[model samples]
Target: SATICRVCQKPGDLVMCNQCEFCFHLDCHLPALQDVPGEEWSCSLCHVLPDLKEEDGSLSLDGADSTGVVAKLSPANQRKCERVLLALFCHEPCRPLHQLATDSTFSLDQPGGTLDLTLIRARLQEKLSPPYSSPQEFAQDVGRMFKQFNKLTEDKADVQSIIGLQRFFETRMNEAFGDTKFSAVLVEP
Candidate 1:
């Protein structure tokens, strides 16, 4: 028995994930598990999570933010979004951002920082699913993590690296949607 539940981090009953060694309490998870299962159950941490899902460019999580629900992605634009996002998620520079989603304590680089690539990726997924009001929103959302990172830390090396990642994603976006003025106006400012 894990003395400290990974979710609650309290000494008591816990279940470990088959994918990652991390443990979770029955009630601490958002959905709240009923009991330990005989078969393997993956924790949110190891579930190829925090990014776009589906072989075809579709996301699977649900967090409908209820923002007017108007203009959405066209089939071509949506496919491009998925492709670019997948490439960014798989990008070498962002590997640690994905890994640190499991960081719940002091080991985290930005303690007070609320933003991360994981959250940004999920937001775009929801917007694309709930539907992006404009390509501008998609571009802005793509740039957010790096923008926010610049504000929260003094780690110059990491900040510069993130800036490079930002430009890379921006380039990928521009390449995908180059036909539109979206490429020219992706104002990083």
Candidate 2:
């Protein structure tokens, strides 16, 4: 029997998250199937949540009062953030964004004012680790990416994809939550 995707609510080319029962369309989830070489892959949710109860290989570390990591963001906000992120990642032309790891250590910092460049990955990692407490927090972190995105590209200061993604996030965030809270937020000086 074919299973439906939890994200797009469709059934085609679906990949079930080994960590959880939820399955999502390859196109509907992050790190799209085409981008992954391993046939065995988990869903976006599992990739984010830390398995606090790590032990047996075959054993499912399914939440049995486990780390309430993603719980930082309520379900509603979490869905919104995930959808917004999925859309951003799913966009083909917007490729070439990056991720880095500091071999020295691990943590995050926002610095005196501007979000530290080092905070970028840690921002997403914190989100991936526990996520923001609300969509507002999530938007703020995502906005940081959009802001620093301008710094990465040495072009004429016109990051086309970043612009589109930013706007897209606001629209999706509002549509998902029916709130204008994030419309004028994020990407401020």
Candidate 3:
């Protein structure tokens, strides 16, 4: 015999996900159980969620408020961003910033802050670019300049700087939206 739902106390056809081990019924969970199979249904609750995906990314499980709609940062994109940030770290103007961020006592592996290479570079370049230009043109020029700069630099700290920037963006974004309701930002960078 089946037990009543915790929410509404309604008997329902139940199923469990092989992944996360959450139990759901055909009627009690409503849309959540929609599209699930009769005998092989798996609830969304039962999944191996990453740390970022928990309190900082989703609302159902934890109080994470991931409001920004960040486009997928592919591995290739990450690699490219890493190279560009590394380039900036070696550049004269950016070198000081990098050095300050990674003083000898600082450990990159130790978790405390994140330095997002992509967002910082993007923001800095956006500040430097001339005004009144088409957004598309600006993006193209930044892309070109980032690649050129990366090619010009030869310091490994530049690469480490990129990692730092990545952490920065991740941490900042999480903090800004940690307790807020879900929101989305689609503005071009």
Candidate 4:
């Protein structure tokens, strides 16, 4: 049977995780893995849990304020956001930024740590055109996909209220990066 990439939802050259039985495209895993691990591959779901968990039993991954917005997010939403962010931007730091800037028509400067939503929409525009004529529409589609991942919920309205994953990432970058600036923006590794 042909395997599908969990991230892109397409059949491609796939690599299976030894620890979690999840499979992904070689191109889908962020930091853009060069090779399937020779031994003991762990999917990001297995990999990120320990790093983002705080000693006091809080998730420090996307929290930016003392008011505890991250704490308010459902575990399912948080997990979905983490996975999406990882796939889109968790590439090898400066290198991928430079590569993308040079190789693609992306403008890398984002003020106040905002994501270049326009650029992202432009890149995805043609491919997403028929199903989605605009970024907000595309975001709704992405949001719907994430809603399906929430096994605990069946109400589509709850998912519809939340902003799309791309918009979330665009705004969430500041929380992910803090005050540090890089030559170009990349996702949290």
Clash count of each predicted structure: 0, 0, 18, 0
Which residue runs does candidate 3 get wrong by more than 4 Å?
1-152, 156-158, 179-189
Q: How close is candidate 3 to the true structure, as a TM-score?
A: 0.20
- The local lDDT score (0 to 100) that residue 35 gets in candidate 2 is 46
Give the per-residue lDDT digits (tens) of candidate 3, residues 21-94.
23345333322234434444332221211132334333554222243222122222322332233333322333
How should the candidates be ordered by lDDT, best one leading?
2, 1, 4, 3
lDDT (Cα, tens digit) per residue for candidate 4, span 1-189: 334454454566666555444456655554334566433554444342223334535434545432243332323233333433443333222112212222132232223122222233232322212222332333333333333322213343334323344343434333323321332233222
lDDT, candidate 1, 15-115, per-residue tens: 55564433556454323345753226543323212233234234424334222223354334543443344334434444333233332542123343443
Please give the RMSD to the true structure for each candidate, in Å.
Answer: 12.9, 10.8, 19.4, 15.0
Q: How should the candidates be ordered by TM-score, best one leading?
A: 2, 1, 4, 3
Query: What local lDDT score does residue 36 receive in model 4, on the 0 to 100 scale?
Result: 61
TM-scores of all models? 0.42, 0.47, 0.20, 0.33
In model 3, what lDDT does residue 47 have? 20
Q: Give the TM-score of candidate 1.
A: 0.42
lDDT by candidate, in order shown: 0.43, 0.46, 0.31, 0.35
Quantify how close model 4 is to the true structure by its C-alpha RMSD in Å: 15.0
